[PDB]
Design a protein around this ligand. Structure first.
Ligand SMILES: *[C@@H](C=O)COP(=O)(O)O
Ligand SMILES: *[C@@H](C=O)COP(=O)(O)O
Lengths: 337, 337
């Protein structure tokens, strides 16, 4: 944790987001990907999970738009149909390799969650399995109900995120901290805005109390919207205004980038919100980019459907959707390249 | 607290610091100024306090360097020798008028302090006395000993600052929040650095929990150094490095400016640290300027000495010291204008 060591972390964080690039999140656990597969009639075999990731990672030209990919631990042990380790597909493309390091969530208080896995995190970061990884991801999730998120749950999750971040950095990995505001709930956009300001300001408190190197941390955040069960409407401009206000109010100049999660919003909406936030005026130092799983890969799944004959078209949709995300990351989606 | 109302606050915060300008703090209570007077053989009469402020405010050309002045409540009731209200001296110069609104400090826990006066703050902000004021100041003070500042004292002071800030803004005043790290103590520069990161990150938490308009808040901060009782040395470059790192780690892009307090450091050291921080590289949105009482007015006091014959020379020293501070505010002190 010397000066050159700290500069390498900042260089990695910037490389992931250079030139309007963003992150393809491919880190779904077998259970989470399985559910997605089963809706579309695809069998949850290890082989189909391996093939799905091969389809994503082998897409030609994807590195123009994708600066990093977040892998699931299992995918590090996997090869392509042709024999090449899946990580080698990304390395050869110059794409940064990430590892999701949380062990999921457990119950906290009444109706809330904390994320787990810190006890062996340092040991796991040193696994030879992840030797090629240069960044990591850890997700917490904030449920919304009456009087919730509670302050205890904000503090505990921010504490856990910050502890994970410092361990990552000590092992030479850039941490993505993901304080996700869960979309499935009944809350107004005002309430999301206000609580996002609490969560993000508290996260910055704990990162600072843990003396995390702030230029080597990426924040993966939810857009500010009302909850899916609210009857409240919003437009991309309003999402952009509220989200950017919350970020300008909470995120220090030293943070290199914010990457938005799609969170259950549509692919089109998530990309449209990104474009709108990048068209907003308001001085800032950090990039506003993407870390999408669903918004980038739902179309791939829906086109592929487990049939090899559909793969070329599935890869085409990945590339085209990645292009749009990247254009959104620079506020240029309305403009012809 | 409508949109135009919020834009006026941001415009005021920017006007105070435009063009490398800074703040002349002249807000010493009769007791605090009195002690300064008595060291230099000057009688603590109301007349000498009035005359001292007249000497400061009537200095020709001071508005090139000073964007705002922080007044003591008593000075709003005062006139020049020639009959002109002292506030009119500043208004005519286009200098923003501020009011210090705290009622000082009281004991908290063991050996710590909190600042007081929130109970009638809203009423006081509406006083016709302060009709010409456009900004305010409120000071908390953090003592350092073993295990101190305590977390309770950080939280309580940040809470008080944030409550004051929101009341100010609701009354159309830009709040300066002053979480001063007291120089008189025995602590290392590492410890100051780490605790400054705790204090400033926690302050940003409470400002966010109070839903303060972040573009309409100014932060008056201590430089990061070791304590006066420490035998540890430092240079301007090291102060600059540590202070800017702490600020980049904690202060959101939305804050318009940080103004350093001189804090018991020499006039020359305080101006030299300002120059050094403004020569540092590292992207940021906020101005780095000054809010000095001692660093700007100790020389004036020492030249004047209560003798009218010395006033012209005293004003010359104010103007020359203000020039240097302003050059420091743009990192140009080594360079000839
Ligand atoms: C990133 C997960 O690692 C965000 O995924 P989403 O875009 O919400 O499916
Ligand atoms: C500002 C007081 O209002 C700072 O005063 P100092 O420069 O520390 O004497």
């Amino acid at each position: 944790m010397d000066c050159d060591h700290l500069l390498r972390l900042g260089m990695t964080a910037k490389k992931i987001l250079e030139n309007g690039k963003g992150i393809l999140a491919a880190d779904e656990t077998p259970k989470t990907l399985g559910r997605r597969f089963e809706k579309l009639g695809i069998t949850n075999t290890e082989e189909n999970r391996r093939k799905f990731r091969e389809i994503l990672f082998s897409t030609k030209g994807i590195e123009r738009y994708i600066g990093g990919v977040i892998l699931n631990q299992e995918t590090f042990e996997q090869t392509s149909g042709s024999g090449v380790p899946l990580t080698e597909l990304l390395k050869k493309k110059g794409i940064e390799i990430g590892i999701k390091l949380d062990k999921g969530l457990i119950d906290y208080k009444e109706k809330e969650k904390i994320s787990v896995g810190l006890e062996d995190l340092d040991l796991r970061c040193k696994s030879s399995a992840f030797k090629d990884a240069t960044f990591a991801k850890w997700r917490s999730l904030f449920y919304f109900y009456d009087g919730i998120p509670s302050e205890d749950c904000i503090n505990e999750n921010c504490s856990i995120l910050a502890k994970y971040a410092i361990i990552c950095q000590k092992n030479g990995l850039v941490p993505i901290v993901e304080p996700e505001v869960f979309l499935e709930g009944d809350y107004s956009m005002k309430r999301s805005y206000e609580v996002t300001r609490q969560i993000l300001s508290t996260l910055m408190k704990y990162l600072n109390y843990e003396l995390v190197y702030i230029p080597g941390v990426l924040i993966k955040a939810s857009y500010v919207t009302s909850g899916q069960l609210s009857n409240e409407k919003y437009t991309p401009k309003k999402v952009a205004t509220f989200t950017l206000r919350a970020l300008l109010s909470t995120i220090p100049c030293g943070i290199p980038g914010i990457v938005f999660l799609s969170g259950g919003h549509g692919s089109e909406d998530a990309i449209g919100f990104l474009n709108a936030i990048n068209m907003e005026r308001g001085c800032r130092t950090w990039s506003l980019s993407f870390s999408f799983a669903r918004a980038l890969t739902d179309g791939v799944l829906e086109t592929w459907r487990g049939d090899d004959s559909n793969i070329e078209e599935a890869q085409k949709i990945l590339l085209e959707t990645s292009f749009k995300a990247c254009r959104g990351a620079e506020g240029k989606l309305w403009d012809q390249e």
